[PDB]
TrEMBL record, chain A:
GO process annotations (BP): fatty acid biosynthetic process; macrolide biosynthetic process
Ketosynthase family 3 (KS3) domain boundaries: 24-446
Shown chain mapped onto the complete sequence: 14 to 913 of 1647
Record organism: Streptomyces lasalocidi (Streptomyces lasaliensis)
Superkingdom, taxonomy of origin: Bacteria
Chain segments annotated as coiled-coil in the UniProt record: none
Originating gene: lsd14
Cofactors required: pantetheine 4'-phosphate
Protein keywords: Acyltransferase, Antibiotic biosynthesis, Multifunctional enzyme, Phosphopantetheine, Phosphoprotein, Plasmid, Transferase
Entry GO MF terms: 3-oxoacyl-[acyl-carrier-protein] synthase activity; fatty acid synthase activity; phosphopantetheine binding
Amino acids binding (R)-4'-phosphopantetheine: C193, S297
Signal peptide: none
Official protein name in the record: Putative polyketide synthase
């Protein structure tokens, strides 16, 4: 009895532990983006800056209307002046690809560069997370941004309305959600210099509470006016030389910096489930207040110790588990000692003396980036953890004598130190304090180390951009990125390019199974030159899709053979077709396609028509498996049986029965007639055959100048001599039967018997009948319909004109070889439509290279393809360059 | 006036690409005559339509599928593109 009570308690205890752990779940950082002083436009650029120990402080910008010469004065009490001459700037703060985000040049000029910087950084951060930014439309993705109003509008005609939302601080976060159609909350936070780290704390809590699935957390600072320099230098808070000498004896103030820094975060369990690459984990986070400090602007060491201990408790860690802190470290004589004291008390006591907490600050390289500073520091530490090095902190002549450094094991990063991976995970804290008293501390941990794929031949490499120039830059940047890489798997690159990047209007695809061919084709695309394996085009904005199912002529000895081995889906559909034909046929479909000994060949009408039916049905099902769902289907003669099956009117058994028995019904007419293609319009072809009366018939009208005629051997021989005399080009079709002629009346009963017991159902995809020239109800495809199909003219051109007239712009011939493509191109030409025609396989090209060439060509024209079905669900994530933004300068003068 | 040399490179470059599918892709453009018929360079109906598609994508024009047979040489194709553009 007590075993059930004890079993219940064991379950409840486990559920209590895992629920409590979920409330403090580690948050994965899966993507980052930034633009910081000194040429930084990426996390690796930021790493290069701190690894090289570079000082990015430089002269004030000269293209912002600032009175740089007149504003200088060494006297701090001089009004409207500043004693600072250098600081951290984004000298390209006005550069923005306005067109990419559908923003007019005039709205862009009146738009605050903080909003513009956040838009490009957000796009790049999602791309670096392996997330196609457009696939985030309609998701519960939150946006948490730290930012302040910096007076960009101190306005072009017809853009004062744009200037309002373009300069609202709330819209710095809101515009991201609007532009990317994100549905989670967009909050703009202002806690002064801790804003972006508070924004990260809120994004983490939003994820822990299930409010968001993914979130953007960051900050931005642009100083379009020199106000922050004139105001804080009056308070003597700035360093005269412009350098933040974090924790140095020579520290004599802080200095301002511009920047944008964003993270894409998600719960660690969701990153592992989604197969995202975890760059680092936010294990613990906490925010608090100074409370009753020695003044509103003064820092409080007791409050900083408390926020650190709260972040450690939230992470389930102690002080000794943290190897380093990316400190707030502003370089002020007031702030620095207080932060170092709190670090010595909170971190420096329960740890080995030979393993001190190593302290540094990104502000020593670029200056204090205000709202953006906190998240900029976490990007620095994520890169430090990935490179295995703790970089140096600049300008430390001597550790500040205002701190009792002997009172705890906390040492400054006066020189770089190696960060060993062995034993335990690397961990670091990041701090951000503000003038309003709100503190933030975050505890980062190294990505867990607990995180065999065969290739797909001729895997298409897709590339696209909003303009041709941007597409050339996409190719150039990808070519450079691949050169700085020893041996990347081509299928992994193909999967990343197709599943983690947005398909824009101007498209390109590299389809090849050879080595050394893709690199040169990328360089050709980059330079605007063509290449054999380079398919290019502009996606049609709108257009419905049609699968075309021809009749005679697409067979070849070997069709389906390569695909049966290299495509288990095609083999499964052929196996279904074979089971469906077995009851009506003496031969084996698989044996016929393989050309096995004793099996019949395509010389018999009763084996080539049901084999072509099986290939076309299987190729249509293969296109649907790859995500191409047609809006309409059209068939030519016997081809209508495959079209009716794909449309849902006929079951595979009923359709196999019709094609098998109707083609067997033709056998008594062998040798009694044939068919000949005339290069003539329908009206002239009809005039030509009148002398022979009922002995000749218009069998099909496929294009404006393409008519097929059928009838008796005698009348065709006479017609051919007349053609020789009149100069009308005619080509005999290699068939021994005159389908669509009076001769099929003699087999009418046996042809009607072929469809006995069929139960025609309504269509799920409209069937545009080549018997009637219009859409037809699936329930009308009875036995008399299949006799009329065989007896009367195939109105393929007229039915094509009805498809073009109802918004159909993509025609896919689902065949072993393209036989109705020229006729389609001819009718499209005559009508003046912007429609496209692509085949599937060609004769002697029945492999995945050809299938993938067809899929890439269709994608290039605007057909949506499920590249997961084509390339596999998951591959090892391959990081790619971010979008090649085509920027222009937009600055209010 | 010199634009005809740039238009000929679009035609020649794409013709070389259509000829370069499969095993032999050791083809070059500068040496062949601009007055050489595409039929003489081994162009069938599928190659002719593929070349129309490539030129149409490069120039941004809707050309007739019979382009290569209506204008039989790269030279004749250039003056047709020159007429359609200006």
């Amino acid at each position: 009895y007590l075993k059930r009570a004890t079993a219940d308690l064991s379950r409840v205890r486990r559920q209590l532990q895992e629920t409590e752990a979920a409330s403090r779940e580690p948050i994965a950082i899966i993507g980052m983006a930034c633009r910081l002083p000194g040429g930084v436009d990426s996390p690796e650029g930021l790493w290069e800056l701190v690894d090289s120990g570079t000082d990015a402080i430089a002269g004030f910008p000269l293209d912002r209307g600032w009175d740089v010469e007149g504003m200088y004065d060494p006297d701090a009490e001089a009004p409207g002046k500043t004693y600072v001459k250098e600081a951290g700037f984004l000298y390209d703060a006005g550069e923005f690809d306005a067109g990419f985000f559908g923003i007019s040049p005039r709205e862009a000029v009146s738009m605050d560069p903080q909003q513009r910087l956040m838009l490009e950084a957000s796009w790049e951060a999602f791309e670096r997370a392996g997330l196609d930014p457009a696939r985030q439309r309609g998701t519960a993705t939150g946006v948490f941004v730290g930012a302040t109003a910096t007076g960009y509008v101190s306005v072009p005609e017809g853009a004062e309305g744009f200037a309002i939302t373009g300069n609202m601080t709330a819209v710095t976060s809101g515009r991201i959600s609007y532009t990317l159609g994100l549905q989670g909350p967009a909050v703009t936070i202002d806690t002064a210099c801790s804003s972006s780290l508070v924004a990260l704390h809120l994004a983490c809590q939003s994820l822990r509470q299930g409010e968001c699935t993914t979130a953007l957390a960051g900050g931005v600072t642009v100083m379009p006016t020199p106000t922050a320099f004139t105001e804080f230098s009056r308070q003597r808070g700035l360093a005269p030389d412009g350098r933040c000498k974090s924790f140095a004896a020579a520290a004599d103030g802080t200095n301002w910096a511009e920047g944008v820094a964003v993270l894409v975060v998600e719960r660690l369990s969701d990153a592992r489930r989604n197969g995202h690459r975890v760059l680092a984990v936010v294990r613990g986070t906490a925010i608090n207040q100074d409370g009753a400090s020695n003044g509103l602007s003064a820092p409080n060491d007791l409050a900083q110790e408390r926020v650190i201990r709260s972040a450690l408790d939230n992470a389930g860690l102690t002080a000794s588990d943290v190897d380093a802190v990316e400190a707030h470290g502003t370089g002020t004589t007031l702030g620095d000692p207080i932060e170092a004291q709190a670090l010595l008390a909170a971190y420096g006591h329960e740890r080995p003396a030979h393993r001190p907490l190593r302290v540094g600050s990104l502000k020593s390289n670029i200056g204090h980036a205000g709202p953006a500073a906190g998240v900029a520091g976490v990007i620095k530490m994520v890169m430090a953890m990935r490179h295995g090095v703790l970089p140096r902190s600049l300008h430390i002549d001597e550790p500040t004598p205002q701190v009792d450094w002997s009172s705890g094991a906390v040492t400054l990063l006066t020189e770089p130190v190696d960060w060993p991976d062995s034993d335990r995970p690397r961990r670091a804290g990041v701090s951000a304090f503000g003038i309003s008293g709100t503190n933030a501390h975050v505890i980062l941990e190294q990505a867990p180390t607990q995180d065999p794929a065969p290739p797909v031949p001729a895997a298409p490499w897709l590339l696209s951009a909003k303009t041709p120039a941007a597409l050339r830059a996409q190719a150039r940047r990808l070519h450079t990125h691949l050169a700085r890489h020893p041996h990347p798997d081509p299928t992994d690159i193909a999967h990343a390019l197709a599943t983690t990047r947005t398909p824009h209007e101007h498209r390109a695809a590299l389809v090849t199974d050879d080595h050394g061919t893709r690199g040169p084709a990328l360089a050709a695309l980059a330079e605007g030159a063509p290449d054999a394996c380079l398919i290019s085009g502009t996606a049609l904005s709108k257009g419905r899709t049609v699968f075309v199912f021809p009749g005679q002529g697409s067979q070849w000895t070997g069709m389906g053979r390569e695909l049966l081995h290299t495509s288990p889906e095609f083999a499964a559909y052929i196996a279904e077709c074979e089971t469906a034909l077995n009851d009506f046929v003496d031969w084996s479909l698989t044996d016929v396609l393989r050309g096995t000994e004793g099996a019949p060949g395509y010389d018999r009408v009763d084996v080539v028509q049901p084999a072509l039916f099986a290939v076309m049905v299987s190729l249509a099902r293969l296109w649907q498996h790859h995500g191409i769902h047609p809006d309409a289907v059209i068939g030519h003669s016997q081809g209508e049986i495959a079209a009716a099956h794909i449309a849902g009117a006929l079951s595979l058994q009923d359709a196999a029965r019709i094609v098998a028995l109707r083609s067997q019904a033709l056998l008594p007419l062998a040798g009694l007639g044939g068919m000949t293609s005339l290069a003539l319009p329908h009206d002239q072809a009809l005039q030509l055959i009148q002398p022979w009366g009922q002995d000749l018939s218009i069998a099909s009208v496929n294009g404006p100048h393409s008519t097929v005629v059928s009838g008796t051997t005698h009348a065709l021989d006479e017609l051919h001599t007349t053609c020789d005399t009149q100069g009308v080009r005619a080509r005999r079709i290699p068939v021994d039967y005159a389908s669509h002629s009076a001769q099929v009346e003699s087999i009418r009963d046996t042809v009607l018997q072929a469809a006995t017991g069929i139960n025609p159902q309504p269509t799920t995809i409209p069937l545009y009948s080549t018997v009637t020239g219009q859409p037809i109800d699936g329930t009308q495809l009875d036995a008399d319909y299949w006799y009329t199909n065989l007896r009367h003219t195939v109105r393929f051109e007229e039915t094509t004109r009805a498809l073009l007239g109802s918004g159909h712009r993509h025609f896919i011939e689902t065949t072993a070889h393209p036989v109705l493509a020229l006729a389609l191109e001819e009718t499209i030409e005559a009508t003046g439509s912007d429609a496209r025609v692509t085949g599937t396989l060609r004769r002697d090209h029945g492999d995945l290279t050809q299938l993938h060439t067809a899929l890439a060509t269709a994608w290039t024209h605007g057909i949506d393809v499920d590249w997961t079905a084509v390339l596999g669900d998951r591959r090892t994530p391959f990081e790619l360059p971010t979008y090649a933004f085509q920027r222009q300068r937009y600055w209010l003068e | 006036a010199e634009r005809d040399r740039a238009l000929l490179e679009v035609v020649r470059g794409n013709a070389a690409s259509v000829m370069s599918h499969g095993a032999m892709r050791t083809a070059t453009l500068e040496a062949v005559e601009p007055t050489r018929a595409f039929r003489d360079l081994g162009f069938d109906s599928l190659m002719a339509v593929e070349l129309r598609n490539r030129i149409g994508a490069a120039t941004g024009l809707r050309l007739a599928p019979t382009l290569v047979f209506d204008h039989p040489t790269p030279e004749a194709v250039v003056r047709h593109l020159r007429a359609e553009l200006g």
